[PDB]
Each structure stands twice: as structure tokens, then as C-alpha cells.
């Protein structure tokens, strides 16, 4: 199983290296597939890449 | 954040639920990212669909 | 310019031809690039692999 | 409804922009979708990593 | 090295076993990466679901 | 037909242009298709975005 994972830009290498370690521990729990199979890998989206309801994650960092 | 997870078909439906409710947890822990905010989907891969160095599931699912 | 589309299963063949229709304006508005470059492709997603916020779009059918 | 954008690298913020809030009202008149639900995010592609027919962006932008 | 294939649905199971094939072959010689190593996995697009310059695989297969 | 390639960062441009190369024999070979129609693109992944068995990349990478 493969987990194709998607965050903003900005975050810590130690809570990327958790995205990995969790997630890879996720799907070995959920289906029982040999920790040796599953793959995990991150793409970091800018701020601008981002849209969420038509507004990019960069426009509305802007806000409170 | 999301997670855009690729498995094989023919796991159960509560594997698939774990999958959806396990990844999510995984990620709101690495990140700390609200859960209102974090999707994951599911692509059940056909076996013959699937390579594994050059070879389907498909014909390796045939063997020991 | 691609778009990769990700909709719940169940939406009409008409919805899915304006997906493809006014995703494809939009990226040539935007872009400016020639239609003919312009590919989109739509991926329909049983409602059991949709998780929102860790729950399954399957589960929040169930509810109003 | 998601969207998955590919585009080549070196457009302007303008047109990335664009992008999200065109896609984003052309997934909302296709569908119906609240705009609340809808997210679209943009991966820029170095023109030495994108193939049209066995050729890159990148030798293709040498010639006329 | 990973490869996601995106096809219209009609194609053989050779052609499929194929593309599994000649994919990872192609990429165990373009980067030397052990075929161990190499996962290849294919969708099965619907003619309706996969737009070609604002038109269908549907709509366009209707003509000649 | 469209492949989506993830390979590692590190990579040479020749080795990069040779996955776009034979990629697109590869799939015009298996299925027939007009090289005309073909489409790979690459996303390079950074070693810290990578996990294999829940260890990225990078840490692999300081072991032999």
C-alpha cells in the first residue's frame, strides 16, 4: 500500500519524518501489509499552490 | 493536509474504514493540523494493474 | 496544462461533460494555453474511500 | 471535489491565482459543490521533467 | 522509481501486462534503479471521464 | 496515455530525459498509441519526502 501525501510548505523535518513514520504505521495496522511493502511520500505544496474554497493558503495566512 | 492512498482491491470495507480513520490520525498527530481539515481517498488498484518489479500482483498472486 | 479531477461517485454524465468543459475553459482562461493542449481527466471515488475530517463520506450519507 | 493541476513552471502568480479561483467556480457550476468543499492545488513542472511525445518542454522551447 | 499510468478503459490484458513491463524496463534503464525497487501501477480511465481539449474520449470516439 | 513518474532528487538531466524518452516508447509500444498523444512527466523527490518501510530516504541513505 502507498500513501501519496500532500502538505503546505513550512513544516518541521521532524513532523515530516512523523508524516512518514505514522502514516506508514497507519496503513500497516489498517491492512496488515508487511511494513517492507509500504511506501509514503510527500509533496510540499507553496502557499500559493493551495486553494481552499477558490482562496490560496497564502491569501488567507494574510488573515486571522 | 491529505492523503491520496493507493491499496489493492479485494480488502475488506472495515480495512478500508481503518485506512480512511488511521491515516487521518496519523496525520492530525504529525502535524497537528485541525481534523476538520485533513481528507484522504482510497484508489483500489485491480491486480492486474499493479506492477512489482516488471511483474503483476496478478501473476504473483498464482504463487507461493 | 492538466487537470486531475476527484468527484464522489454518483453525479450525473451531464455533470461529469461540464467538469471536463468549464475545467478546461478555466485552465485556458488563466493560462492562456491553447485548448488543445489542455487535458483533464476525472476520477469517481466510491463513497466508502472519501474520508472527511477521519469519517467517510459513506458514514455522512447516513446523516442530515 | 478536488483538483489536481499540472502546469510548467514560469507562469505568474496572477495566472496561478487565476488557476484556483477559475477551476474552483468551474468545479462549483459543474457540480453544484458548496465552494466551502472544493480545493484545487498546482504542481509546477520543470520544463526538463514534462514529455510531449518523448520530447521535453525544455528541447522544445529551443526551437520556434 | 514509481510510474502511475493513466489509460482509457478498452485496452487488452496484454496490452496492460505490457505497459507493466516496458515501463519498468524503461525505467530500470533510464536510471539503473534495481527493478526491486520499481512499482508501476495503471487507471483505467472511462471514455466519459478523460477530456481531450474540452471534448470527451466518449463524445470523440462517435466520430471518425 | 500519461505516465506520472516520482524518482527520487539526484538525478542527471541525461537520465531524466532518458525517462521521458523511453517511458513514451514504453507506452507506445504496449498500447499502440500515437506517440503524438503521450504524456510523462517527472516529480523529484526530496530523500526527506521519500519513506520505504516507515525510514526515509535520507536516513538510508547515511547507511550502506
Not at 513550512?10 to 508487511?34: C, S
Not at 509500504?38 to 505544496?45: D, G, K, S, T
Amino acid at each position: 500500500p502507498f500513501a501519496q501525501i500532500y502538505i503546505l510548505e513550512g513544516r518541521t523535518p521532524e513532523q515530516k519524518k512523523a508524516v512518514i513514520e505514522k502514516v506508514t504505521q497507519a496503513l500497516h495496522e489498517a491492512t496488515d501489509a508487511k511494513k517492507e511493502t509500504i511506501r509514503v511520500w510527500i509533496h510540499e505544496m507553496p502557499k500559493e499552490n493551495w486553494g481552499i474554497a477558490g482562496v490560496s493558503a497564502k491569501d488567507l495566512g494574510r488573515l486571522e
